[PDB]
Symmetry: C6
Subunit: 67 residues, 6 copies
């Protein structure tokens, strides 16, 4: 397919879907996708942290999300 990353992240952002983000170092972060760009995802919980996409292994939504 083509151009599927952004629609997926954008539903998670607009719909405030709780996600777990598994990093390449084994950290699992939880929160809401506040925003994202070419290279980073801003993930919001107690604060907003800037997660580099190159360190993300998988983004797991708390519920089914259909593109």
């Amino acid at each position: 397919g083509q151009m599927l990353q952004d629609p997926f992240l954008n539903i998670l952002r607009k719909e405030h879907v709780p996600v777990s983000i598994y990093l390449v170092n084994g950290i699992k972060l939880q929160g809401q996708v506040e925003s994202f760009d070419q290279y980073v995802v801003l993930l919001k919980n107690t604060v907003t942290q800037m997660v580099y996409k190159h360190a993300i292994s998988t983004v797991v939504p708390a519920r089914p999300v259909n593109l």
Copy 2:
């Protein structure tokens, strides 16, 4: 060879082949390839999660798949 990634992923998607996806952090995910683009594979089980290709080490189909 040339342009073999997409034909492989596309048989797995169209034919709903069960796969195991081994990540660079040791996680093994199981499910069906729902869709994919330049950078991500959407993998469906209980939910659909967005797996970044840069974190995938190998995609192992449950059965032989011939391109």
Copy 3:
């Protein structure tokens, strides 16, 4: 979204926000973002060290920072 990395890093730099930077090898660095470019973040504590972005997993500010 678009062009969000730099605004985020730039608030952290200009506002001297304490950050924790989690590396892909599990090291957690703490300090202030002194400066940054396409590829590196200069992080200042006792000395200034040059952190490659490709090794950063997440930048966690000590407080909420809103872009």
Copy 4:
């Protein structure tokens, strides 16, 4: 040198040389190089799995192979 990757992989494929492929996560895969493209190597044993090159550390042939 220049353009040595493909000649090497191509001898392994055409000559059906048994290889061990060591991944960045410590997995060692064994089999035959069925095919490869810009980004993936298809490795055949009981099934054919799609190995991303970015996750390969070294390809070790079972015997000397001279380019």
Copy 5:
């Protein structure tokens, strides 16, 4: 900021500043930056070894260095 990596490495090289270089695999190398290019840093101790930047997580000087 822009074009800060090279000025930093260049002060370390010209001023023969002792550095520790932390790699993504946990190795910590110590020595002096002899030279560097787009992709590698030559680090000199008993011998000169060629460190790929993509494997460096952070370069820590023994003393403050101000760009």
Copy 6:
């Protein structure tokens, strides 16, 4: 500096310098640089194996080598 990787690898190859190559997964390989290209180094011991540069952390010669 500029264009230093290839001169370094080329002295190691032409001069048959024994090297240790440390991979991002902790494997240490030993042998001689037989050849190399944009993306791989062919390393020769009992056989020749194809090491991807993206998995190399540092190349350590057995002796001083001066570019």
